[PDB]
Amino acid sequence: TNILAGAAVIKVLEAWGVDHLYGIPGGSINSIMDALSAERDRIHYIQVRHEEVGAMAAAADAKLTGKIGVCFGSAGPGGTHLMNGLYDAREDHVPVLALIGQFGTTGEMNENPIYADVADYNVTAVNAATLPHVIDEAIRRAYAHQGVAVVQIPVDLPWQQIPAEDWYASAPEPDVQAVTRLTQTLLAAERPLIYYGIGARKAGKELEQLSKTLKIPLMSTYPAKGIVADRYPAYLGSANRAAQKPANEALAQADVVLFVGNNYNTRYFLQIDIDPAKLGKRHKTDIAVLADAQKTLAAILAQVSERESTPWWQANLANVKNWRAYLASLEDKQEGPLQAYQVLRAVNKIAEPDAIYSIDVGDINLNANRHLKLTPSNRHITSNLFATMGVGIPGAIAAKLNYPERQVFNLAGDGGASMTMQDLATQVQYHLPVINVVFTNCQYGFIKDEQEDTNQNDFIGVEFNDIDFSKIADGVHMQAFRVNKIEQLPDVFEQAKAIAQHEPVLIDAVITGDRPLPAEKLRLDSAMSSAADIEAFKQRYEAQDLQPLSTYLKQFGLDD
Amino acid sequence: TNILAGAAVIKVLEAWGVDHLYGIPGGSINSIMDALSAERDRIHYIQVRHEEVGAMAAAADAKLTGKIGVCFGSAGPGGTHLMNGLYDAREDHVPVLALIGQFGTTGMQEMNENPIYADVADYNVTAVNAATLPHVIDEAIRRAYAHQGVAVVQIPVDLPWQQIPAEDWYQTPLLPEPDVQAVTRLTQTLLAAERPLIYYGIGARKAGKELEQLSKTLKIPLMSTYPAKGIVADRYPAYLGSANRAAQKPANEALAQADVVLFVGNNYPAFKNTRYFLQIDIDPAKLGKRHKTDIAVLADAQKTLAAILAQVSERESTPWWQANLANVKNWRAYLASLEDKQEGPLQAYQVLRAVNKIAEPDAIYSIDVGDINLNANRHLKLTPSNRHITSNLFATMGVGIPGAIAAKLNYPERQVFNLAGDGGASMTMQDLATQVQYHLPVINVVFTNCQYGFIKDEQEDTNQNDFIGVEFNDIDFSKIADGVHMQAFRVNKIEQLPDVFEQAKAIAQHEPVLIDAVITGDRPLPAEKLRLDSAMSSAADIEAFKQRYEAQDLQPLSTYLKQFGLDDLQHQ
Amino acid sequence: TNILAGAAVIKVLEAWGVDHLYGIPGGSINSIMDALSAERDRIHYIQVRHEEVGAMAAAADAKLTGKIGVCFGSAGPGGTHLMNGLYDAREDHVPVLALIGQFGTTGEMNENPIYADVADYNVTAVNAATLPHVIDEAIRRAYAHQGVAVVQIPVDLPWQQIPAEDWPLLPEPDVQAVTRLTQTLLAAERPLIYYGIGARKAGKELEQLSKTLKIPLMSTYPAKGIVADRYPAYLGSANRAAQKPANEALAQADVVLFVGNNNTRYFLQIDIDPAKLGKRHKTDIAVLADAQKTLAAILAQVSERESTPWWQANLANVKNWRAYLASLEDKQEGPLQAYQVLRAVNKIAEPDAIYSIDVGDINLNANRHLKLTPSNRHITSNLFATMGVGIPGAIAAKLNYPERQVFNLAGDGGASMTMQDLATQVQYHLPVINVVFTNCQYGFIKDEQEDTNQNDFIGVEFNDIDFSKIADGVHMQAFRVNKIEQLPDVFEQAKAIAQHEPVLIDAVITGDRPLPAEKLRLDSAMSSAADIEAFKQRYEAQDLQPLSTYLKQFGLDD
Numbered sequence A: 001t002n003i004l005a006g007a008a009v010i011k012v013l014e015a016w017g018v019d020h021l022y023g024i025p026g027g028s029i030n031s032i033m034d035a036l037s038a039e040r041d042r043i044h045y046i047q048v049r050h051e052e053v054g055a056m057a058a059a060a061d062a063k064l065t066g067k068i069g070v071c072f073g074s075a076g077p078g079g080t081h082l083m084n085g086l087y088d089a090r091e092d093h094v095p096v097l098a099l100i101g102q103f104g105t106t107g108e109m110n111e112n113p114i115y116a117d118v119a120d121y122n123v124t125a126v127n128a129a130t131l132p133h134v135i136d137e138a139i140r141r142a143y144a145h146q147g148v149a150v151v152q153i154p155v156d157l158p159w160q161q162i163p164a165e166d167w168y169a170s171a172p173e174p175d176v177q178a179v180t181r182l183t184q185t186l187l188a189a190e191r192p193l194i195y196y197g198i199g200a201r202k203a204g205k206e207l208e209q210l211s212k213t214l215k216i217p218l219m220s221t222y223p224a225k226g227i228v229a230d231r232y233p234a235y236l237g238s239a240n241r242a243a244q245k246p247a248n249e250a251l252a253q254a255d256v257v258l259f260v261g262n263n264y265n266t267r268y269f270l271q272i273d274i275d276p277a278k279l280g281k282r283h284k285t286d287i288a289v290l291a292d293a294q295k296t297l298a299a300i301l302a303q304v305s306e307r308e309s310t311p312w313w314q315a316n317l318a319n320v321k322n323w324r325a326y327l328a329s330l331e332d333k334q335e336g337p338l339q340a341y342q343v344l345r346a347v348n349k350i351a352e353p354d355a356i357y358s359i360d361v362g363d364i365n366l367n368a369n370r371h372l373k374l375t376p377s378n379r380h381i382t383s384n385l386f387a388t389m390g391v392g393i394p395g396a397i398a399a400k401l402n403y404p405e406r407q408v409f410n411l412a413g414d415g416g417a418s419m420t421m422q423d424l425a426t427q428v429q430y431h432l433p434v435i436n437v438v439f440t441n442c443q444y445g446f447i448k449d450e451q452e453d454t455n456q457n458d459f460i461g462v463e464f465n466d467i468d469f470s471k472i473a474d475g476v477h478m479q480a481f482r483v484n485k486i487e488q489l490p491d492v493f494e495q496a497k498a499i500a501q502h503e504p505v506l507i508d509a510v511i512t513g514d515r516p517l518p519a520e521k522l523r524l525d526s527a528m529s530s531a532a533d534i535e536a537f538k539q540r541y542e543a544q545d546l547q548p549l550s551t552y553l554k555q556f557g558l559d560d
Numbered sequence B: 001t002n003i004l005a006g007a008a009v010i011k012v013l014e015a016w017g018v019d020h021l022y023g024i025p026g027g028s029i030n031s032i033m034d035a036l037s038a039e040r041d042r043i044h045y046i047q048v049r050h051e052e053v054g055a056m057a058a059a060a061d062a063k064l065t066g067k068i069g070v071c072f073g074s075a076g077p078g079g080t081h082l083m084n085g086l087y088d089a090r091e092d093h094v095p096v097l098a099l100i101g102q103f104g105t106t107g108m109q110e111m112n113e114n115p116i117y118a119d120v121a122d123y124n125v126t127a128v129n130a131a132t133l134p135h136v137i138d139e140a141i142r143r144a145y146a147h148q149g150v151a152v153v154q155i156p157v158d159l160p161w162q163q164i165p166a167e168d169w170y171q172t173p174l175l176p177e178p179d180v181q182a183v184t185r186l187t188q189t190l191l192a193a194e195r196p197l198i199y200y201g202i203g204a205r206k207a208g209k210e211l212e213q214l215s216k217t218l219k220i221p222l223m224s225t226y227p228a229k230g231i232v233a234d235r236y237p238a239y240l241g242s243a244n245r246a247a248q249k250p251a252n253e254a255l256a257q258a259d260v261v262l263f264v265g266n267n268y269p270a271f272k273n274t275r276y277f278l279q280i281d282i283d284p285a286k287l288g289k290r291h292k293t294d295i296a297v298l299a300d301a302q303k304t305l306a307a308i309l310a311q312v313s314e315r316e317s318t319p320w321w322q323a324n325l326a327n328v329k330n331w332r333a334y335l336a337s338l339e340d341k342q343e344g345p346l347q348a349y350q351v352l353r354a355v356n357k358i359a360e361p362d363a364i365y366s367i368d369v370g371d372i373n374l375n376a377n378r379h380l381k382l383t384p385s386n387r388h389i390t391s392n393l394f395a396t397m398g399v400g401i402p403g404a405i406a407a408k409l410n411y412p413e414r415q416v417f418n419l420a421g422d423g424g425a426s427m428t429m430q431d432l433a434t435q436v437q438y439h440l441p442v443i444n445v446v447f448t449n450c451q452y453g454f455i456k457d458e459q460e461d462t463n464q465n466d467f468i469g470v471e472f473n474d475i476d477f478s479k480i481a482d483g484v485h486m487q488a489f490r491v492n493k494i495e496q497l498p499d500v501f502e503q504a505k506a507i508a509q510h511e512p513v514l515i516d517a518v519i520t521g522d523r524p525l526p527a528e529k530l531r532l533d534s535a536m537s538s539a540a541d542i543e544a545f546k547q548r549y550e551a552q553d554l555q556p557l558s559t560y561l562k563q564f565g566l567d568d569l570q571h572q
Numbered sequence C: 001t002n003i004l005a006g007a008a009v010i011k012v013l014e015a016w017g018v019d020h021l022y023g024i025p026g027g028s029i030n031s032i033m034d035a036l037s038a039e040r041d042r043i044h045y046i047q048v049r050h051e052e053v054g055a056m057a058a059a060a061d062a063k064l065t066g067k068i069g070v071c072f073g074s075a076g077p078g079g080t081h082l083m084n085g086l087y088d089a090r091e092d093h094v095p096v097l098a099l100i101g102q103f104g105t106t107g108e109m110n111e112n113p114i115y116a117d118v119a120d121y122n123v124t125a126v127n128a129a130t131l132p133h134v135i136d137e138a139i140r141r142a143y144a145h146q147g148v149a150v151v152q153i154p155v156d157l158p159w160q161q162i163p164a165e166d167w168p169l170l171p172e173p174d175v176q177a178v179t180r181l182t183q184t185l186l187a188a189e190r191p192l193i194y195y196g197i198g199a200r201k202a203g204k205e206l207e208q209l210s211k212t213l214k215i216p217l218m219s220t221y222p223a224k225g226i227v228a229d230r231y232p233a234y235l236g237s238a239n240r241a242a243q244k245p246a247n248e249a250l251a252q253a254d255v256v257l258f259v260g261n262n263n264t265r266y267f268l269q270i271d272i273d274p275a276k277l278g279k280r281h282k283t284d285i286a287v288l289a290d291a292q293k294t295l296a297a298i299l300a301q302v303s304e305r306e307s308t309p310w311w312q313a314n315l316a317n318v319k320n321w322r323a324y325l326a327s328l329e330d331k332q333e334g335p336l337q338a339y340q341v342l343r344a345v346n347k348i349a350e351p352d353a354i355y356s357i358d359v360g361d362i363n364l365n366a367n368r369h370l371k372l373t374p375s376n377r378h379i380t381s382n383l384f385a386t387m388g389v390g391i392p393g394a395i396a397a398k399l400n401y402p403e404r405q406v407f408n409l410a411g412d413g414g415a416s417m418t419m420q421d422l423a424t425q426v427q428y429h430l431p432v433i434n435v436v437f438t439n440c441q442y443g444f445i446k447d448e449q450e451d452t453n454q455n456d457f458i459g460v461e462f463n464d465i466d467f468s469k470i471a472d473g474v475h476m477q478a479f480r481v482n483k484i485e486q487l488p489d490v491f492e493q494a495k496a497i498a499q500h501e502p503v504l505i506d507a508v509i510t511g512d513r514p515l516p517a518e519k520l521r522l523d524s525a526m527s528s529a530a531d532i533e534a535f536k537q538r539y540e541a542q543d544l545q546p547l548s549t550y551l552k553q554f555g556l557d558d
Ligand SMILES: Cc1ncc(C[n+]2csc(CCOP(=O)(O)OP(=O)(O)O)c2C)c(N)n1
Pocket: A360, A361, A362, A363, A364, A387, A388, A389, A412, A413, A414, A415, A416, A417, A439, A441, A443, A444, A445, A446, A447, B024, B025, B026, B027, B074, B077, B078, B081
């Protein structure tokens, strides 16, 4: 028996469990549209307002669920609009299929070169009969390479009849010597760190147990926030840069670092990874164990005993408390000019235990990293390695489509919200009760801070005219609020919390131009800087009560 | 002696007369920003809210002035946001320079960026050395002009902050006359034709006078490509419009009837009854191109048309001439009947009449992509004093706003419109803020049908199942404008138009304004699928057609041919 | 009414005047082969032994005639073998069409990204009916961009019946600017005319203008022969096949006129392409017009000037240089060197001879020793500078000009790379005279390593390959000579074999370094006394004078 080549493509997608896909129709892709139309019962098509949002939401689908994301764009400008979302997925290593329209084989640009760089698989379908098989292979290449597969489909092909009976959709324990050699080196260290990334997703319980047992402080990569609960008193934050003070400071001091599902004064580097091509990378590393994170951590645990509090442990616990109190003093202001810190507190107050956070790119990464309180039941996404602005809105859309029953925030700077603002209309249209929080500083704040640090001449391109996002949201028929004072927060967030039981809501938070404390440029220690520099720093960042790790090392007898 | 490499880069730009440039800063491009900062008296940096608008605006600059446009974007996602503006430049064949940030040659997303631009660019290099950086920029610019396309330079951020010797760093063809025997052959074929057409594209942009003189002397009807609208004034009675699919009825119908077609600065973007193809073009690669071409002349359009003119004199009306004239009058009367409605549900047609009404004689129109191309092609009344831009060959939506920014920056003393559908306006809406920020008095008109109307009509013609992706929720663009602090109006009835457009006219003496026209889901008459030939299509289809398009009084070309004693393509 | 798509393709090629094309068949291109088979009397298919040679030969076709060269390769490995020839065509700016086989649309490497960088037009045909259109457009884009067009052809489409019946301006000179240019030129104290191949058609005028105004001539390497080499005021080329007199003169010049090209006060330039106007140094006067018309127009508004000291110093430098060159060429006995071999080539060369020249020391040596006139042609890989082009250049030369004498001058390194296609000259009866200069080195790279490297030589001295035995292998008459005295009889024999069949001479030469015109040790006011004498000894340069000697001798400073 026969079938339209288009209808078979859609069946290939359903066979792989694709629940929703994103795009904007064009004549060059209307035969795929026709097939999607017949299947609206079985697959959910989300019409976006800019195809980049579709490509970003697809990456975000795959970041959230591990399942391939699917987007499409019309020939020429529809497909090229996909680029920021497709690079995002290439660089964060998530599977995404993109379909691109193309004029019919009989019925004039060469599209294939356009996708050669971003895609791990990039083919133009030549024949209706193999069209479904090409889609099937694209999907398995995407999964195989954890990246982008691109298929360009000449528009006549999906309208051709083909046979149905012919197509298909084709849908270990660690080394016990090494584990001991690893444990021993870890045991002997004076300043041990356990430093994990998303490779340790399944291993949060073990990480926390090992940390408290052996009195060893924990730090994560930025995407690894929430794998171990933030409130855990020996969790230092992340290093590198949405960087938190305690992690940045301890790293300089450690003598042995255990890298768990990661790959970033240290004499020994210890490493656990599932992938051998990852065992060496940043500096000559001394013990590399090839194995699963959860198991190797359980194998360490099964052969160690509770040590008692060491100096290192106690200086770190003290630094963490001091940092946390600093953050709390920012959060706890009750009245006055609104700043990012209180908006994040108010977010914390309304957040449910399993909230999902879609985070844009800018000061929000730094601020969310420090103020959000996450646990293993939270999820948070962003564009990590490509770091494209604009992903807050699309990430929130995907989150809500995958998890209709969970609370979803979109946290975004105004520069980033502006880039994908139109797709606020997409939340209204598809009834996705996202809570959007726009941090309005009228600046590219992250880049102003960078220019402050490097440029000789005046600021340029980093301060701009205000956009009132509560009117933008009104424009797309979404309820919204604009606040500019701390004391407005409680009531506005309660309203948002309730509106989002049924419909999207936006809060436009007009915040000050205050720079968030920079963890790599501390001026806290009387040794390394002037008394006046320290006074200016403390004034600027309201950090009068913040102490350097210097202070706590000495309080416990350790050298700096 | 001694300058920073970044400062030398900006001096290159100034030397080539770059007045303004677009982009969004990032750490990977903060050293070029620093150098822009020092030169802010001599070059105007325009901060846009999405880098695609900067690249689209750059293409639009080059379209309007022939001067290279300049945009930039930070490493990674800033530069990739440029793609739609760059492909638009490439496909419309206008020079654009894009500068891409990259991390410094010291700490060097550690992406290889160079392969990203290999397909769009005619010149695509990573600067390796501070001292040759200015030469690289200068070569990039030369190559963009040479190829009339995109040049891309990736610039490691440490380089513009390096000192270099100031002591090291750093044209228009007048053409020969046409071959006279070849022009005579061409003139004789043209004169002998019973049904001749002159079909010109933007290659004929300097030849509007000759085109119109030749047309009236010899009683030969004119049609144009869509971009060539306005080279001859629309009001000229023998201008048939364009053929293709912003297509106008008279041009479309005449193509099928013609025995001889003269392509001038064109090369066809279908004829069947055409015995001879005549072509005048400046590029020998273009001579030929479709389905065998008969006489081909390598020369400038203006000189060649003046040569032809010099060797002919006035002919009397021909039946062909009077038939096309009558067909044009009938088409125009149909369009005016749509425009002249005074009350009722707003349609695009009355919106454009209201634009015509407030427009200055030298107004510039930035036009987006969708039903607006078809409608503005039919309703706008342009002359050689106007300019219009759109994305012609790449046909990317979103260019209305960026083009109007570029237009107002090049010509601050000229009235500038942005005509955009709601789908296209949505894609670059954030950059309404930029017209506000830079005080650019654009008149924005959004055509709100809550549809991808162009695509709906395509699904209507081809799809077996129900519409999908083509009807969507409203966005109120007057509130979007209020969001960015721009005065604005929403209108949904014909009778609201005069007063709203007059306030807009006046507001735009000082500041941007936006009008959000809520319009019906009516489908504009498809000039490519007429059902009027009381012979060629059932009596049922004809009645259905005339009713849907309010085309009760429209006659097919066949009627006017018959009136003047000429056969059709129904008689073979 | 109907035609096979493949036949239509071959008809497009014929319609465009394509006489011959090169390639190696495979199943992925067997339908185009089938169509070539049916047309053997209207288009000549040359089967090569390595596809790179077919691409390089295609490039040489276009350099010699200005008409598009055509090559093809089978899917995957046959097409990728083309690359050195496609890049040669891209960089030397000549139109070449390349057809690549591909698995059938219905019947799976993605081949299109392979050609993206080399090609100005790079398309997969998707449909039998438009195929002839695709080929025609490819040819037009190749000509338009003076570069490579690539078409991938699914092997099923050429076997499909399709309807048979559905298949530049030079600017002239702005006469104020020509007067302006003439003036700065005339005002000049140490003027030079520096031309490249853009002055192809203007050799007469360049020479008249030089004799009239007493201005010395310089060329780019590829412009050698545009003005007879005998002309006593031709200084040679500057850069790196460079000859001493041009090298020295340029450093002393105050005005330089650049004609069809791309201490100095003014840069004058004539060129046909606006993008070229100012491309090297900073220029005062730039003329956008045709090289020949412009030089004719300059000639009209000028009059016979008299001998000058700059004129006389250059003439005398040129005489000294040519006497040094002649002295190497005139050795009569002893260990053979390249100099005597080139002399021996000069002595049997006919006046309208074509030289295909490979890459290495040979470009330098032949630039100095060959005596060319406007009646000669010479081709090589100029900008890409790929080794191996000697053999395929000669094949293409003899195929375009069966009635003219054709030399292939190659080093051993470069001849090794395409040696297999000596079999192609035999097979197609193409009477090339091949001369292989055997130093058992990558001589040019050894010299560079001498200049730059701290450690010993590496990779630049290798074992001997006897090329007369190689030629004997593919059934071509050949000789090996290693002494100066052997040349006359061998070259006279070679000369006469080449009236009928290809022949090869394997000239075993010394490892002597040819004089480096950029590393001269001849100025006592500049180089050490032990240096200068060492230099002279090594290069047999005892009679050679720096230009400064001659500047002293006629009044001029530095
Ligand atoms: C598309 C894109 N352009 C530029 C950048 C470089 N960039 C990084 S952070 C940033 C500023 C973000 O500004 P905003 O969203 O307002 O956040 P803020 O720092 O002000 O909170 C920029 C422009 C990027 N990552 N993506």
